[PDB]
């Protein structure tokens, strides 16, 4: 299943967004959610990074808060604040959802893991269809 052990971070939630890509899109989403929540509202959680999916689970009950196919992840980024991570999913053909996280000490390891999953996945797909 998973490629690496789950990441203990805060899930800030998800919001619809207008476009599949852009650091401006994800920073707009982050500012909005941060302005409407406080740190005590944040959901401790871990992100399981598997070959084909990302799964977001509650901190140690490990209940499922979201599951996302790598093929429908259009974009990811670290926000202007180095703690923040977001990715955009194409929820449907014309529908985008931004999933957001607060990471300590920063978002480097999570973004790396998710980027690596996308790059592995793309080569696997080219290989399958060749």
């Amino acid at each position: 299943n998973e490629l690496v052990q789950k990441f203990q971070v805060y899930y800030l939630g998800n919001v619809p967004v207008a476009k599949p890509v852009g650091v401006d899109v994800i920073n707009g989403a982050l500012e909005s959610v941060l302005s409407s929540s406080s740190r005590e509202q944040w959901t401790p959680s871990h992100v399981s990074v598997a070959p084909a999916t990302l799964t977001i689970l509650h901190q140690q009950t490990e209940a499922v808060l979201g599951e996302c196919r790598v093929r429908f992840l259009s974009f990811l980024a670290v926000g202007r604040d180095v703690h923040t991570f977001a990715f955009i999913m194409a929820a449907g053909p014309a529908s985008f959802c931004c999933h957001m996280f607060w990471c300590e000490p920063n978002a480097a390891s999570l973004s790396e893991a998710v980027q690596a999953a996308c790059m592995l996945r793309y080569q696997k797909c080219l290989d399958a269809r060749s």
């Binding site: 599949p20 890509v21 852009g22 650091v23 994800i26 790598v70 093929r71 429908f72 992840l73 259009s74 974009f75 990811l76 980024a77 670290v78 926000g79 202007r80 180095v82 194409a90 920063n106 978002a107 480097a108 973004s111 790396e112 980027q115 996308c118 790059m119 996945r121 793309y122 797909c125 080219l126």
Partner: peptide, 28 residues
């Protein structure tokens, strides 16, 4: 100078990453 963690963070902050798996299936 800038460590490995650091250079990749600035990349992730400045451009993020567009998933080519998405575009691959999208172009179909």
């Amino acid at each position: 100078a800038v460590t490995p963690e650091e250079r990749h963070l600035s990349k992730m902050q400045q451009n993020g990453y567009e998933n080519p798996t998405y575009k691959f299936f999208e172009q179909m």
